[PDB]
């Protein structure tokens, strides 16, 4: 597995037994990403959501083929006094997903 | 030598320190203020820039520069009696070394904070064909580690039950050099605080049932072999039963957070006894165990002041 | 998250820094991760599990007393991001399936 988070987060990663990286910087950390699918992790990434809302730009971008790494939008600390609306993570979801903007 | 020399010092330093309505007006703030704040301070002497790594940078070596400095400036039995204090330190970067070598990461992996010994004997102590060349060359004459290394050396080479028998072999050592020489206030300190070690390594290790016995050590006094097994297998009433003793609100605690709470807080009230001896080695325990507590609350307060964390987090941190 | 991050926290804000990071770069990656079929609707997507050793933890007695409980929490974060990655990936391929369904059928009307 691998992330690329926060140079503060990425410590307790290596602490679980688990690769982990940080920039904080989102160009760089785009650079980092196709760096990182190139060297592929174990087929496993989690992306931060404040450097990169989308991680899926570097691998449309790259690979178009067997979706290797698996990318995910992690959150971060900076963030984990309000989680930023899982909720309506999940309705950009649905809208993303099947196209249908519905709510319940 | 003697031991009103550094006495004076320790004194001195400990004119200077933090007080309480710092951190009680900086328990609401947003790091700039933070950073304001430490910018009159002695650990502002070595701050850099601005930044996580510059204040951590900052308070690792104003603690060098004003705690690591006494083990130095006396000879002899004062020396002796004064670097069984800050000693973790040199366990942690040797622990840390043992298991590069035992990995094969190279040598520059670790980033190995200061302790008692100058870092050549470090840079030296990597190449050896046995590791008793490595314990030869770590040893400086009268200390635990050259003395307790070679001690468990005596089975193999580079293995990590070698480690957990180090670790062990340290504390018993360390409490046995205590009870070696007469400083009426360091001895009892000792055996207060391998009782708390051993206590905590209980906690952490429950419900696997692993054979305690090996795990227990001696050197404390307010546990014994019953209480450290009746503690592993899930009861509470033995830590109910510890009355009397200086663990006074610390009863019905499982959790591990609260645990290392009410332990490092009667650490600290039991090393703040020290003011007792004027004199002899009490006062610059008071001095350096009052220090870490300052050090670690202050860094503690630091990632509060940063990351924006409630101080509702944190008022349970500040609580001695 | 919420939890795990409170944890490293308080545990590299008592104990230093400097020491759960050699204790960090002293465990070992633990490889073995992987990722095999589930043949949904006739498409392979890869369902993901670690290995994660458990009885094997470098010196359990740890003279830090902070890196057990974070190691513990980040195991925990960890099989939360394993089991949101496994949702999700089978979550966007019915929802690209979906989609798939929806312009065939409304190609197929308006065109044949």
């Known amino acids: 597995m691998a992330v690329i988070a926060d140079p503060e987060t990425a410590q307790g990663f290596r602490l679980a037994g688990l690769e982990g990286y940080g920039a904080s910087s989102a160009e760089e950390a785009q650079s980092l990403l196709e760096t990182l699918v190139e060297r592929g992790g174990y087929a496993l990434v989690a992306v931060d959501e404040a450097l990169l809302p989308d991680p899926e730009r570097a691998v449309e971008r790259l690979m178009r083929g067997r979706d290797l790494p698996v990318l995910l939008p992690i959150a971060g600390l900076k963030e984990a006094f309000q989680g930023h609306d899982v909720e309506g993570y999940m309705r950009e979801l649905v809208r993303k997903t099947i196209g249908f903007d519905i709510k319940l | 030598d003697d031991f009103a020399y550094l006495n004076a010092r320790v004194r001195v330093r400990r004119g200077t320190l933090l007080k309480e309505s710092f951190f009680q ?6 790091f700039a203020d ?3 704040l430490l910018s009159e301070t002695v ?3 070595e701050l850099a820039g601005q930044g996580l790594p510059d204040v951590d940078r900052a308070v690792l070596r104003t603690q060098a520069k004003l705690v690591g400095d006494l083990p130095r400036l006396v000879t002899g039995e004062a020396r002796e009696a004064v670097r069984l204090l800050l000693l973790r330190n040199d366990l942690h970067n040797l622990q840390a070394l043992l298991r590069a070598k035992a990995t094969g990461r190279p040598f520059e992996e670790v980033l190995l904070l200061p302790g008692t010994l100058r870092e050549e004997v470090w840079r030296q102590a990597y190449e050896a064909q046995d590791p008793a060349g490595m314990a030869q060359v770590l040893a400086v004459p009268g200390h635990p580690l050259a003395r307790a290394l070679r001690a468990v050396l005596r089975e193999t080479q580079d293995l990590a039950r070698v480690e957990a028998l180090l670790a062990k ?8 050099a205590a009870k070696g020489l007469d400083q009426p206030a360091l001895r009892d300190y000792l055996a207060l605080e391998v009782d708390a070690e051993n206590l905590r ?3 952490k290790l429950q419900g696997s049932g692993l054979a305690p016995d090996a795990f227990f050590l001696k050197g404390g006094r307010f546990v014994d072999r019953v209480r450290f097994a009746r503690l592993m297998e899930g009861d509470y009433a033995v830590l109910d039963e510890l009355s009397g003793t200086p663990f006074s609100g610390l009863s019905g605690v499982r959790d591990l957070k609260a645990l290392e709470r009410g332990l490092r807080c009667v650490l600290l009230k039991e090393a703040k006894k020290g003011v007792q001896d004027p004199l002899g080695v009490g006062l610059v325990l008071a001095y350096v165990k009052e220090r870490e507590w300052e050090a670690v609350r202050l860094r503690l307060l630091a990632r509060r002041a940063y990351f924006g964390l409630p101080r509702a987090q944190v008022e349970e941190e500040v609580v001695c | 998250a919420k ?3 409170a944890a490293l926290l308080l545990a590299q804000a008592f104990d230093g820094p400097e020491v759960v990071a050699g204790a960090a770069l002293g465990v070992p990656p633990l490889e073995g991760v992987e990722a095999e ?8 997507v890869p369902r993901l599990k670690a290995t994660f050793p458990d009885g094997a933890l470098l010196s359990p007695v740890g003279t830090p007393a902070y890196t057990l409980e974070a190691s513990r929490a980040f195991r925990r974060y960890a099989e939360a991001l394993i089991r949101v990655a496994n949702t999700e990936t089978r979550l966007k391929k019915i929802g690209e399936e979906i989609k798939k369904t929806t312009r ?3 190609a197929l009307e308006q065109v044949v």
């Open chain 2, 169 to 176: 072999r340290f504390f018993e050592d360390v409490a046995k």
């Open chain 2, 34 to 36: 933070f950073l304001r």
């Open chain 3, 3 to 5: 939890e795990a991050y």
């Open chain 2, 25 to 30: 007006e900086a328990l609401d703030l947003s």
């Open chain 3, 37 to 44: 079929v589930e043949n949904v609707w006739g498409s392979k």
């Open chain 2, 201 to 203: 390594t209980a906690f």
């Open chain 2, 43 to 45: 650990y502002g002497g």
């Open chain 3, 104 to 106: 065939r059928v409304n």
